[PDB]
Design a protein around this ligand. Structure first.
Ligand SMILES: CCCCCCCCCCCCCCCCCC(=O)OC[C@H](COP(=O)([O-])OCC(O)COP(=O)([O-])OC[C@@H](COC(=O)CCCCCCCCCCCCCCCCC)OC(=O)CCCCCCCCCCCCCCCCC)OC(=O)CCCCCCCCCCCCCCCCC
Ligand SMILES: CCCCCCCCCCCCCCCCCC(=O)OC[C@H](COP(=O)([O-])OCC(O)COP(=O)([O-])OC[C@@H](COC(=O)CCCCCCCCCCCCCCCCC)OC(=O)CCCCCCCCCCCCCCCCC)OC(=O)CCCCCCCCCCCCCCCCC
Ligand SMILES: CCCCCCCCCCCCCCCCCC(=O)OC[C@H](COP(=O)([O-])OCC(O)COP(=O)([O-])OC[C@@H](COC(=O)CCCCCCCCCCCCCCCCC)OC(=O)CCCCCCCCCCCCCCCCC)OC(=O)CCCCCCCCCCCCCCCCC
Ligand SMILES: CCCCCCCCCCCCCCCCCC(=O)OC[C@H](COP(=O)([O-])OCC(O)COP(=O)([O-])OC[C@@H](COC(=O)CCCCCCCCCCCCCCCCC)OC(=O)CCCCCCCCCCCCCCCCC)OC(=O)CCCCCCCCCCCCCCCCC
Ligand SMILES: CCCCCCCCCCCCCCCCCC(=O)OC[C@H](COP(=O)([O-])OCC[N+](C)(C)C)OC(=O)CCCCCCCCCCCCCCCCC
Ligand SMILES: CCCCCCCCCCCCCCCCC[C@@H](O)O[C@H](CO[C@H](O)CCCCCCCCCCCCCCC)COP(=O)(O)OCC[N+](C)(C)C
Ligand SMILES: CCCCCCCC/C=C\CCCCCCCC(=O)OC[C@H](COP(=O)(O)OCCN)OC(=O)CCCCCCC/C=C\CCCCCCCC
Ligand SMILES: CCCCCCCCCCCCCCCCCC(=O)OC[C@H](COP(=O)(O)OCCN)OC(=O)CCCCCCCCCCCCCCCCC
Lengths: 174, 115, 121, 54, 54, 98, 347, 49, 140
């Protein structure tokens, strides 16, 4: 078992609690980067190496722009950190306490939330016995974006081109 | 497992180096030594004031083009398909639309830094 | 959606082939005449908004308004009649197929039916 | 004429209804246009819909 | 000897920022005619740097 | 359902509650918006990889692409707001009222 | 904005909506919503000013939140069924999330504040496109998934929409905010009938779109954005004021005008399903909308407000641009009550 | 010549007038033919005439 | 919400007046809490103590209205020995309206609230008796 997926999921939730308590965009980006790396680990354990590395790389690139933007647009004299503010620390502690409570309840008994029913057992239990051979199912399914999914490529490329046009138009001014 | 052990080893070695650096030498600290550096004179303002970014549009375009390359990365596996003509058409379609985005921004002066 | 997804429905078909067995609307239908009246009113409003003589100017334009409205109204009436015929057909077929749900009841005369009398005074 | 027609029959139905509608209109439309405020309202609505609707 | 038509008092009662003003809504003001608010005199605050002597 | 799905859904709920509760900066809310799509990506790929839905493996990539488009749109609006008002504070977006 | 870029952005908005309407896959529906929003932001920001920037920011924030909630609902539904097709949703929690997201997109209460704020922020053409097309898409999705809609949640949001629209419109004195609150009320009516007859939903959508197009185009023709600005139009073109008054009477639901047909059909359809309290409350609450329509009609056509001295020069000059299909919208929004049984063709 | 400036609609636009009249005539003859064909097809399908 | 309504309706009409008052008080308190939450969100208070004071005032007003309505309705039904009578609910509704007027310190608000709440409560009793439904299930 080793509970590696559960530990990683808990760290994922912790990073979300951080950047959602919202200290300041520098530390929000730091927490989001931690969460992206940990999610890469979770999906690597579940099987998708390409998907994990891709989401990690995309969020590393995206948060690089956010740093430059918060240096220019979203900075103040004394940037707030988690312990610097009463509201930020309160929200951070609330999120951590909620995560701890739900984790403890799930481990102690099969916890049914007011939304969904969860069973405390093995993420290794839920896996499938069967195997593939001499190819990666994830890689083949992703590579099927060009043979299958011609429509998806068309709409995605159109959206990206129009996105360039839009960002040029919004920031025109005048 | 092995990769986790490798990451742990690297982080532990770096942290030990920091610990040795901050605890081995003799330390003498006073307000003048730890003051911020600005070539011998005091800083007029603060380093936390807003710092204008003259390439704000190139950054957004970088986000979009970064996800374009994310789309392009699974091409080596896409070359093993039986639908080679469709695969080649869609790959060239994505690359041509990327080129069109670059051409549009270049001609509309999106690549020029603000003055 | 009552009749959406009815079996044998061709998507995006304004008028199916089975609608050809219904009587087409007469060209002097009062509904067609009202569609033409709507076209004429649109033409008069066009002249009024553009500040031309309302009744006199743009006779060709007013004719085009009336003709377009009559054309579209004719096809709309055909589709409406087809949908109503389809509804009645389905209802009759279901009643025929479910006799236990739509039973024929024995008719009793008012000489046999007893009704309470409520005097007005 | 005065007490009933001009005063009390006027107060019961049309004056009271108009006053209530005007007050509720002021309450609804008196907003500062702050996204923080009405997004907090959205959060409350979402929690209520998740919990009290089954 | 002629039909009554609205005057400046009527028009001004209809020309506020909102109907039914309160304290806050009276502190409010109607928007500009061309929807363009006057520019705000923000401070650019260029970074000041000591380039030298060391 | 495993506890992993519970944690991912909890992370999404936390990021949604973060977005709906602004403090001052528009950038922090944008970061909360980017976290929600990260949790959506992780949840979708966990569901797809477990069930061996081979043709659905491309869906998280499209999800990421439109996350990028949303982030670009939000950053463009943020630079326009900052140009107008000097700060990315959400208190300045009060000209329009309900 | 370059005319070519503007028309390609309009076409992209329309393409996103059409993708939403023709797709059978939840991912493609989400893609359509995203494409619509992305191309719709610059249209709002077409005339650059702080109000337009603020309106675009608020619209983007609301629509991004709604799209995120919608994708969460889609993924939750996939978890419990493994189905990507848009049909009845297999999870009540996913259905509740989907209903909340689509209501936030449409502006149903309590998700309505952005509607008056954004509409006042943006120009008349942008508001016309916003109301019409951006109501056109989510309602199609709701009609597709209607058979799993929670009647209690849908009807609660519908009654809230009707009440809020009436009250806000009562208070407002700006024409664009009046239009926005009227839009909120009409969306309330449509979604109230939604869990019983999507055909009646479509009929109300079409009539509302016609009346809104006529009203917005009359405002654009008269170049009036406030009550007092619209009070000068009787001294320039008294025909436009009369047409606007008839259209306002139609919007308020007075017989025998075309605005009575949707309310009539919806009341009848809900009564067939043994609903009486809801139709009666809905019918009585529309008197608020009629009141502020009539207040607007007093200022512009039924009374003559004071004018200014430069109106003489305006008399000397003539209106150049011609509105496309304005007479047709005026006629369709007022005189098509005797054509009611064509809703079977609409079926 | 009353107007100091030539009105935009001083003279009829003969191209537009011809197109309008042609479109109206085409629509009318098409409607007549469509109705005749509809009546004939209905009678043939129902076995009336 | 549904659980609270089920408890209130599961207590019989003319019996257990203390339990009826408790259930109606709980329902009123929940309604007041929801109203106070929306008021806090949409009109922020100047301080945490002011927010707590406003929440307490709204919650206590709603709870008092609910308690008075339930107690008065049950007692009236018990003493008259006529359950399933809309007059009991009308009396409870006017008592709740008088409670609202007392909380707001306004005779006019009290009178209007008595009238409107009495009509509403009598209508609710008539609906329970006759089978009226507000959110009707789709059919036909
Ligand atoms: C995969 C990793 C997963 C990790 C877990 C999950 C993380 C999720 C995201 C983050 C969520 C929140 C994290 C905890 C926040 C705690 C609250 C807080 O405000 O702390 C204070 C502190 C803020 O203080 P500051 O303003 O920087 O310092 C001024 C002092 O307050 C001025 O006061 P002072 O000067 O009197 O105090 C001095 C003292 C103050 O020391 C501290 O505050 C130590 C705090 C350690 C927190 C560790 C967690 O500092 C020292 O003595 C120096 C040595 C200690 C600091 C350096 C080493 C830290 C541990 C590494 O918080 C932080 O700086 C947060 C750092 C979080 C780092 C997490 C790991 C980063 C990894 C990056 C690469 C990732 C790659 C991809 C994977
Ligand atoms: C969907 C998913 C949902 C969530 C699911 C779970 C996952 C997430 C878990 C959390 C993870 C972290 C993410 C959350 C991030 C939060 C955040 O960024 O907040 C920023 C946000 C604004 O930041 P800021 O602008 O820098 O702060 C300005 C200062 O607060 C300025 O200070 P001030 O001088 O202006 O006054 C301070 C304070 C003053 O505060 C007040 O006036 C509120 C007083 C409430 C008293 C309640 C008493 C009753 C308690 C319940 C009933 C008990 C039973 C008895 C019956 C009642 C008896 C009275 O606040 C205000 O004045 C601002 C007014 C607006 C906010 C008020 C608080 C929330 C309103 C909505 C709920 C209202 C509940 C009312 C009671 C009814 C409950 C059913 O902060 C807050 O709203 C407060 C601090 C954060 C607390 C978060 C706690 C967790 C929330 C979830
Ligand atoms: C086609 C036809 C259709 C129908 C047509 C007619 C339509 C209706 C017509 C009008 C009837 C409804 C009137 C509604 C009540 C007034 C609403 C209002 O805003 O009042 C403000 C006004 C107070 O205004 P404020 O400025 O907020 O407070 C300053 C006052 O000075 C504060 O007052 P104060 O401190 O100077 O002293 C006031 C004191 C004065 O004491 C009384 O008024 C007690 C009168 C006892 C009965 C005396 C006559 C005995 C014979 C009666 C008839 C017997 C045969 C049946 O009254 C109270 O304290 C009232 C509390 C409750 C006492 C119990 C009796 C009620 O309220 C009153 O004066 C309440 C008087 C209520 C008298 C009974 C009214 C009829 C009740 C419903 C019958 C159905
Ligand atoms: C207003 C002025 C005009 C008033 C006209 C008179 C209306 C009388 C209707 C009474 C009636 O027959 O009630 C049905 C119903 C008939 O019995 P039933 O066959 O067992 O049906 C209930 C089922 O057990 C369970 O039925 P269900 O689960 O299908 O639905 C019952 C409904 C709860 O049932 C009701 O709400 C109706 C009964 C209580 C109504 C009390 C106030 C009267 C309001 C009438 C107009 C409603 C407009 C709603 C607009 C919402 C947005 C503003 O609960 C829900 O739908 C749960 C989720 C939504 C709750 C509401 C959240 C938003 C409320 C916002 C406004 C406050 O009455 C009850 O069950 C009474 C239970 C005890 C209630 C307290 C005493
Ligand atoms: C290459 C990368 C890794 C580098 C690792 C370390 C490299 C260097 C190894 C040799 C270091 C020799 C000792 C230097 C200590 C600093 C000198 C100093 O501060 O002197 C002034 C001070 C003077 O003290 P004082 O008491 O006279 O002064 C009082 C203060 N004032 C000046 C104001 C009067 O020296 C000391 O305090 C002496 C402390 C003990 C020195 C020996 C202990 C360290 C032994 C190191 C052995 C190697 C293993 C452990 C080290 C880590 C590596 C694994
Ligand atoms: C030049 C002559 C004049 C032309 C003027 C043209 C103006 C109108 C343009 C034509 C509009 C209709 C397009 C006709 C071809 C499209 C065929 C297709 O769209 O028709 C059907 C659908 O068409 C429309 O739905 C109905 C067309 C009729 C609408 C106009 C009348 C609306 C009723 C108003 C009554 C009161 C006003 C009366 C008119 C004045 C297909 O059904 P289906 O693909 O499966 O629908 C799936 C979705 N559903 C099931 C939920 C509905
Ligand atoms: C039913 C129609 C017939 C019954 C109509 C009820 C009217 C009874 C007497 C009302 C006359 C009271 C009055 O004049 O004012 C109305 C007075 C206005 O408030 P004030 O400004 O404080 O008082 C003004 C000074 N008098 O009362 C109100 O209209 C406010 C009512 C508060 C909310 C009403 C409760 C509604 C709850 C039920 C909703 C379902
Ligand atoms: C000039 C201004 C615009 C008005 C133009 C009106 C054109 C009308 C004529 C169309 C061409 C004639 C035609 O094709 O007629 C064939 C058909 C005759 O009907 P049919 O069924 O053959 O008759 C048998 C039973 N009598 O014709 C028909 O069936 C046509 C009837 C359909 C409805 C036509 C519109 C009705 C009138 C609306 C108002 C327009 C007239 C206003 C005149 C104002 C004058 C100041």
């Amino acid at each position: 078992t080793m509970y590696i997926a559960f530990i990683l999921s808990t760290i994922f939730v912790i990073g979300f609690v951080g950047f959602s308590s919202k200290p300041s965009p520098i530390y929000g980006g730091l927490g989001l980067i931690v969460s992206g790396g940990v999610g890469c680990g979770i999906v690597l354990n579940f099987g998708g190496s390409f998907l994990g590395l891709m989401v990690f790389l995309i969020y590393l690139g995206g948060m690089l722009v956010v740093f430059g933007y918060t240096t220019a647009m979203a900075t103040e004299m004394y940037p707030e950190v988690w312990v610097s503010n009463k509201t930020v620390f309160g929200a951070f502690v609330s999120g951590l306490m909620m995560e701890f409570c739900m984790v403890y309840y799930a481990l102690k008994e099969e916890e049914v939330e007011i939304i969904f029913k969860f069973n405390g057992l093995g993420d290794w239990v839920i896996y499938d016995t069967g195997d593939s051979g001499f190819f990666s199912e994830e890689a083949m399914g992703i590579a099927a974006l060009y043979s299958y999914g011609t429509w998806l490529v068309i709409v995605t490329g159109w959206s990206l081109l129009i996105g360039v046009v839009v960002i040029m138009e919004i920031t025109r001014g005048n | 497992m092995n990769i986790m052990l490798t990451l742990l080893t690297n982080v532990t070695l770096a942290s030990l180096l920091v610990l040795i650096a901050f605890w081995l030498p003799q330390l003498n600290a006073y307000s003048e030594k730890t003051s911020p550096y600005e070539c011998g004179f005091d800083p007029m303002g603060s380093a936390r004031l807003p710092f204008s970014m003259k390439f704000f549009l190139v950054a957004i375009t970088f986000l979009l083009f970064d996800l374009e390359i994310a789309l392009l990365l699974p091409l080596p596996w896409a070359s093993q398909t039986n639908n080679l003509k469709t695969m080649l058409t869609m790959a060239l379609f994505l690359l041509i639309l990327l080129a069109a985005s670059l051409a549009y921004e270049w001609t509309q002066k999106g690549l020029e830094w603000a003055e | 959606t009552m009749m959406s997804g009815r079996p044998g429905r061709v998507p995006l078909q304004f008028l199916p082939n089975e609608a050809r067995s219904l009587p087409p609307p007469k060209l002097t239908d009062p509904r067609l005449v009202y569609m033409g009246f709507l076209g004429y009113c649109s033409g008069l409003i066009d002249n009024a908004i553009r500040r031309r003589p309302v009744v006199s100017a743009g006779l060709h334009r007013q004719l085009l308004y009336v003709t377009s409205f009559v054309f579209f109204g004719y096809y709309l009436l055909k589709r409406q009649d087809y949908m109503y015929a389809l509804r009645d057909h389905d209802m009759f077929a279901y009643v025929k197929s479910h006799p236990e749900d739509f039973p024929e009841k024995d008719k009793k005369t008012y000489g046999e039916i007893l009704e309470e009398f409520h005097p007005v005074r | 004429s005065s007490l009933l027609d001009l005063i009390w029959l006027e107060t019961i139905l049309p004056k009271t209804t108009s006053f209530i509608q005007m007050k509720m209109s002021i309450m609804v439309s008196n907003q500062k246009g702050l996204i923080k405020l009405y997004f907090l309202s959205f959060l409350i609505t979402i929690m209520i819909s998740m919990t009290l609707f089954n | 000897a002629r039909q009554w038509q609205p005057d400046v008092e009527w028009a001004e009662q209809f020309g506020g920022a909102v109907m039914y003003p309160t304290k806050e809504t009276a502190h409010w003001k109607p928007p500009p005619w061309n929807d363009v608010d006057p520019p705000k005199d923000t401070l650019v605050s260029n970074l000041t740097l000591n380039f030298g002597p060391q | 359902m495993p506890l992993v799905y519970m944690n991912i859904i909890m992370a999404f709920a936390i990021a949604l509650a973060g977005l709906l509760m602004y403090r001052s900066h528009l950038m922090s809310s944008l970061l909360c918006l980017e976290g929600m799509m990260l949790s959506l990506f992780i949840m979708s790929t966990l569901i797809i990889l477990n069930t061996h839905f081979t043709l659905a493996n491309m869906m998280p990539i499209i999800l990421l692409v439109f996350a990028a488009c949303e982030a670009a749109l939000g950053l463009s609006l943020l630079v326009m707001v900052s140009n107008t008002y000097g700060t990315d504070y959400v208190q300045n977006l009060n000209l329009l009222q309900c | 904005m370059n005319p070519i870029i503007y028309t390609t952005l309009i076409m992209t908005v329309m393409s996103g909506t059409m993708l939403v309407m023709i797709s059978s896959h939840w991912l493609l529906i989400w893609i359509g919503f995203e494409m619509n929003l992305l191309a719709m932001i610059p249209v709002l920001m077409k005339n650059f000013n702080p109000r337009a920037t603020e309106a675009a920011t608020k619209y983007f924030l609301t629509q991004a939140t709604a799209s995120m909630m919608l994708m969460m609902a889609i993924i939750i539904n996939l978890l419990y069924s493994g189905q990507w097709t848009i049909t009845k949703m297999f999870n009540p929690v996913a259905m509740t999330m989907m209903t909340m997201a689509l209501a936030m997109k449409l502006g149903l209460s309590p998700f309505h504040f952005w509607v008056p704020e954004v509409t006042q922020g943006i120009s008349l053409q942008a508001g016309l496109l916003l109301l019409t097309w951006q109501k056109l898409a989510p309602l199609s999705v709701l009609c597709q998934i209607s058979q799993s809609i929670n009647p209690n949640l849908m009807l609660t949001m519908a009654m809230l929409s009707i009440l809020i629209g009436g009250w806000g419109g009562l208070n407002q004195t700006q024409l664009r905010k009046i239009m926005a609150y009227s839009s909120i009320a009409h969306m309330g009516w449509m979604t109230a009938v939604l869990p019983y007859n999507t055909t009646m939903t479509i009929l109300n959508l079409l009539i509302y779109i016609t009346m809104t197009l006529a009203m917005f185009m009359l405002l654009i023709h008269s170049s009036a954005t406030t009550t007092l600005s619209l009070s000068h139009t009787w001294n320039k073109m008294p025909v436009i004021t009369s047409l606007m008054m008839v259209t306002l009477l139609s919007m308020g639901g007075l017989p025998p005008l075309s605005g009575f047909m949707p309310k009539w059909m919806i009341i009848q359809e809900m009564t067939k399903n043994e609903s009486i309290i809801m139709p009666t409350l809905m019918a009585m609450t529309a008197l608020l909308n009629l009141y502020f329509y009539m207040r607007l009609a007093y200022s512009s056509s039924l009374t003559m407000f004071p004018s200014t001295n430069n109106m003489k020069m305006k008399w000397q000059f003539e209106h150049t641009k011609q509105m496309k299909l304005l007479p047709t919208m005026i006629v369709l929004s007022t005189l098509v009550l005797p054509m009611t049984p064509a809703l079977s063709s609409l079926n | 010549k009353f107007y100091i400036r030539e009105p935009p609609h001083g003279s009829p636009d003969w191209l537009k007038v011809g197109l309008t009249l042609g479109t109206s005539v085409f629509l009318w003859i098409y409607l007549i033919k469509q109705h005749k064909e509809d009546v004939l097809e209905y009678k043939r399908r129902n076995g009336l005439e | 919400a549904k659980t609270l309504l089920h408890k209130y309706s599961d207590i019989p009409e003319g019996t257990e007046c203390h339990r009826k008052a408790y259930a109606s008080t709980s329902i009123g308190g929940a309604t007041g809490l929801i109203v106070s939450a929306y008021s806090i969100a949409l009109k922020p208070p100047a301080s945490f103590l002011e927010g707590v004071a406003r929440t307490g005032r709204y919650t206590f007003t709603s709870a008092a209205i609910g308690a008075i309505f339930g107690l008065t309705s049950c007692i009236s039904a018990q003493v008259r020995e006529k359950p399933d009578d809309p007059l009991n609910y009308f009396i409870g509704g006017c008592a709740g309206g008088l409670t609202l007027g007392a909380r707001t310190r306004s005779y006019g608000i009290g009178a209007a609230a008595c009238a409107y709440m009495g009509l509403t409560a009598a209508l609710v009793k008539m609906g329970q008796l006759e089978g009226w439904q507000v959110f009707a299930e789709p059919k036909v």
